Amino acid sequence: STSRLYTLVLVLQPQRVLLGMKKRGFGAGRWNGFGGKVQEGETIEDGAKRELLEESGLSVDTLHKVGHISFEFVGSPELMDVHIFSADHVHGTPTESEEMRPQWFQLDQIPFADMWPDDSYWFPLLLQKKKFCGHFKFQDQDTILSYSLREVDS
Numbered sequence: 001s002t003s004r005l006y007t008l009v010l011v012l013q014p015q016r017v018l019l020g021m022k023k024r025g026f027g028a029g030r031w032n033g034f035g036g037k038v039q040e041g042e043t044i045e046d047g048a049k050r051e052l053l054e055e056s057g058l059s060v061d062t063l064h065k066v067g068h069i070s071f072e073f074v075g076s077p078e079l080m081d082v083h084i085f086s087a088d089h090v091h092g093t094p095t096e097s098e099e100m101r102p103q104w105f106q107l108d109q110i111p112f113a114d115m116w117p118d119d120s121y122w123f124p125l126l127l128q129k130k131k132f133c134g135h136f137k138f139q140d141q142d143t144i145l146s147y148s149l150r151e152v153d154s
């Protein structure tokens, strides 16, 4: 049983981060970066850009490679293969979409309590400008059974 490709784009700036409140579907009622499924016929980076445009209304020329996290759940055959990107520069205005309502948070005021539990572990690596690689086994949606997390030169 193989995995499916996901992207996650974190809109960063010197003092703040633009998260998105998920309004519907998987992760509804939680703050997260912008992203979703990688389709057939686009590269992973194209998918990241697309989902950022569609969910926030923002454009980019380029993204940074910051993380590669593989998620799995107990009693589930399908794995999430997440390619995490930072967008430290953006064009346009943040606009509320059907799927996401964007909001700015200062980097010392990130609402980890209402984000996915894994974010508390890998966000510090992102904010130190470290590239990271890891696996997370979830018991349920609020409970990490086991996890592995390391930095990489890549």
Ligand SMILES: Nc1nc(NC2CC2)cc(-c2cccc(Cl)c2Cl)n1
Pocket: 006, 007, 008, 026, 027, 032, 033, 035, 036, 037, 071, 082, 116, 117, 118, 119, 138, 141
């Ligand atoms: N921060 C974070 N954490 C996650 N933790 C995994 C237990 C669910 C999953 C995701 C994610 C990334 C891209 C697309 C989608 Cl649908 C999701 Cl849910 N993001």
